[PDB]
Amino acid sequence: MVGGVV
Numbered sequence: 001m002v003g004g005v006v
């Protein structure tokens with residue numbers, strides 16, 4: 001999985 005970036 002590629003985590004989101006905020």
Ligand SMILES: O=C(O)C(F)(F)C(F)(F)F
Binds near residue numbers: 001002
């Ligand atoms: O981590 C994932 O979901 C994946 F698709 F396997 C990646 F290719 F990005 F590594």
